[PDB]
Amino acid sequence: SMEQVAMELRLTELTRLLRSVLDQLQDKDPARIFAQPVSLKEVPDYLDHIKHPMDFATMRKRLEAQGYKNLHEFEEDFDLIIDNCMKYNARDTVFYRAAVRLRDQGGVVLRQARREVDSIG
């Protein structure tokens, strides 16, 4: 149908906007602490601590398969990256501190993304 195509153009445009949001969030992590999944070879207990691991490469795979239906789902994954880190790593660590700085900096990008998603529909 024509509606299904219009829908798919919206999903495609959302994917376009979320791709740009993802790039901007990831620039706030120049150390690449959140770039890839936590290694289960190097942290073999990780899943005993963290039940839903997340990272930017995993978010990008979902994104490129148009797996985010709306901004809320994308924010959920970004918040997992942060929140997982802040639970697994202690407050005095470079990892925890990196998550705080990413949360703080990402806030600004996410604020305007919500406006753009509402605004453009």
Curated annotation (Swiss-Prot):
Domain of life: Eukaryota
All copies of domain Bromo, residue ranges: 9-113
Compartmental location: Nucleus; Chromosome
Entry comment describing in which tissues the protein is expressed: Highly expressed in testis.
Disulfides per UniProt: none
Cross-link Glycyl lysine isopeptide (Lys-Gly) (interchain with G-Cter in SUMO2): where in chain: K41
Record's signal peptide: none
Subunit structure, as described in the record: Component of some HBO1 complex composed of KAT7/HBO1, MEAF6, ING4 and BRD1/BRPF2. Component of the MOZ/MORF complex composed at least of ING5, KAT6A, KAT6B, MEAF6 and one of BRPF1, BRD1/BRPF2 and BRPF3. Interacts (via PHD-type zinc finger domain) with unmodified histone H3. Interacts (via PWWP domain) with dimethylated and trimethylated 'Lys-79' on histone H3.
Known role: Scaffold subunit of various histone acetyltransferase (HAT) complexes, such as the MOZ/MORF and HBO1 complexes, that acts as a regulator of hematopoiesis. Plays a key role in HBO1 complex by directing KAT7/HBO1 specificity towards histone H3 'Lys-14' acetylation (H3K14ac), thereby promoting erythroid differentiation.
Protein name: Bromodomain-containing protein 1
Source taxonomy: Eukaryota, Metazoa, Chordata, Craniata, Vertebrata
Residues of the full protein shown: 555 to 674 of 1058
